[PDB]
């Protein structure tokens, strides 16, 4: 898997065990993501922190 980095111009290949890409938002998915990369498990949404995960190259 390849996943976009914080500015999705750049990207990396995920290490072993991380087969999701993610975007992390402060409060709302209608904002500039505040973190991006590879991840093992898609974290649960919380009151102020939202995660969008996906499983294809550079989907984040």
Residue numbers in the entry: 1 to 60
What do the study authors state?
Cobra cytotoxins (CTs) belong to the three-fingered protein family and possess membrane activity. Three-finger toxins (TFTs) are disulfide-rich proteins from the venoms of cobras, kraits, coral, and some other snakes. For the first time, a spatial model of CT13Nn with both “water” and “membrane” conformations of the central loop (loop-2) were determined by X-ray crystallography.
Structures of hexagonal (with three molecules in the asymmetric unit denoted A, B, and C) and orthorhombic (with six molecules in an asymmetric unit denoted A, B, C, D, E, and F) crystal forms were solved at 2.3 and 2.6 Å-resolution, respectively. Analysis of the 2Fo-Fc electron density map of the 2.3Å structure revealed that the correct variant is the LLVK sequence. The most ordered molecules in the hexagonal and the orthorhombic structure are B and A, respectively. A root-mean-square deviation (RMSD) between coordinates of Cα atoms of molecule B in the hexagonal crystal form superimposed on the other two molecules ranges from 0.26 to 0.34 Å. Unusual conformation of the loop-2 in all subunits of the hexagonal and most subunits of the orthorhombic form was similar to that found by NMR for cytotoxin 1 from N. oxiana (5NQ4) in DPC micelle. Apparently, these conformational changes are caused by the repulsion of loop-2 from its neighbor molecules in the crystal cell.
